[PDB]
Design a protein around this ligand. Structure first.
Ligand SMILES: CCc1cc2c(cc1OS(N)(=O)=O)CC[C@@H]1[C@@H]2CC[C@]2(C)C(=O)CC[C@@H]12
Ligand SMILES: [Zn+2]
Length: 258
C-alpha cells in the first residue's frame, strides 16, 4: 500500500509515511500574483540547453520522465535566484483528467491543464542523490500548459508514449531537444520549496515561468492514455497526478518582472 494519487493513498495520506508533508517549505503553492514582490537584484534566467543529451523515457508509475546524461555540464540552468550551476537530469509533467485541472502550482487560484517540471541539481553536491539532501540541492523550472494550439516540440514525446504505457516500461529517447518546450518569455516567480511527490524533501528552489505554453487537446489526450499500473494489472489511467497547493507559511514569492 504505497503512495499514489488515489482516494486511499493520495496527497491527504502522504504525511503518514512522510511527515515533512506538513513542513515549512512544501510545494506546490498558489502564486498570488498581486502579493508576489518584484525583486530587482533577481538576475535573468540562463537556460543553456544547446548540448542537452536525452537518453531514455520511463513510465515510473507516477509520471513519465525524459532522462538526460548528467555526467557532464551539458544542459545547465544558472542565474536568476541561483548561486552556482545546476545540471538538467530529467523532465516530466503533471496533468489532469480534464483540461480544467492538472497543474500543481496555481496562479491566483487558476489551475492549468498540465505543468512541466525540468529538474536540475546543484553541481557542488556531485550528484542528484546527494543534492536532494541539501536545502539548495535542486532547481526545478516549472512551465504551465494550456490547451489550444499544438506545441510542435512536444510531439516527439507524445508519439513515444504508446511504447511506455505501463509502470516500469522504458524506451530509448535520444536527441530530444528540450528547448522546444519553452515559452518565449523567461519571466518567472521563485520561492523555496520541496519535491511535490514523496519523499517531499525540502531541497528545491522553484522557478515558475509566467508564460504558459500551449499544447493541443490531442496532445494532452495522449498523456491521459498512460497507465499508473504495471502491465497485466488492472488498468488505471494515469490522470490527476498532481499534488494540490500547500500552505505558503513563512515564505515570500519573488517576481523577476514588474
Ligand atoms: C525533482 C524531481 C523529482 C525527484 C524525485 C521525486 C519526485 C520529483 O518530482 S517533482 N514534482 O519535480 O518534485 C520523488 C522520488 C525521489 C526523487 C528524488 C530522489 C529520491 C529522493 C531518491 O533518492 C529516492 C526517492 C527519490
Ligand atoms: Zn513534478
Amino acid at each position: 500500500h504505497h503512495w499514489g494519487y488515489g482516494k486511499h493513498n493520495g496527497p491527504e495520506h502522504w504525511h503518514k509515511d512522510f511527515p515533512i508533508a506538513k513542513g515549512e517549505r512544501q510545494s506546490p503553492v498558489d502564486i498570488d500574483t498581486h502579493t508576489a514582490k518584484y525583486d530587482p537584484s533577481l538576475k535573468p534566467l540562463s537556460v543553456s540547453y544547446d548540448q542537452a543529451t536525452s537518453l531514455r523515457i520511463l513510465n515510473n508509475g507516477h509520471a513519465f520522465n525524459v532522462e538526460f546524461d548528467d555526467s557532464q555540464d551539458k544542459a545547465v540552468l544558472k542565474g536568476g535566484p541561483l548561486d552556482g550551476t545546476y545540471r538538467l537530469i530529467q523532465f516530466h509533467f503533471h496533468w489532469g483528467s480534464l483540461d480544467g485541472q492538472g497543474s500543481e502550482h496555481t496562479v491566483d487560484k487558476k489551475k492549468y491543464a498540465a505543468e512541466l517540471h525540468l529538474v536540475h541539481w546543484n553541481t557542488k553536491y556531485g550528484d542528484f542523490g546527494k543534492a536532494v539532501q541539501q536545502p539548495d540541492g535542486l532547481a526545478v523550472l516549472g512551465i504551465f500548459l494550456k490547451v489550444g494550439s499544438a506545441k510542435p516540440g512536444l510531439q516527439k514525446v507524445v508519439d513515444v508514449l504508446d511504447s511506455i504505457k505501463t509502470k516500469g516500461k522504458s524506451a530509448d529517447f535520444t536527441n530530444f531537444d528540450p528547448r522546444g518546450l519553452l515559452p518565449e518569455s523567461l519571466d518567472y516567480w521563485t520561492y523555496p520549496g520541496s519535491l511535490t511527490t514523496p519523499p517531499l524533501l525540502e531541497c528545491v528552489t522553484w522557478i515558475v515561468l509566467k508564460e504558459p505554453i500551449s499544447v493541443s487537446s490531442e496532445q494532452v489526450l495522449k498523456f491521459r492514455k498512460l497507465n499508473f499500473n504495471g502491465e497485466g494489472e488492472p488498468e488505471e489511467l494515469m490522470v490527476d497526478n498532481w499534488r494540490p497547493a500547500q500552505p505558503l507559511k513563512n515564505r515570500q514569492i519573488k517576481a523577476s518582472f514588474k
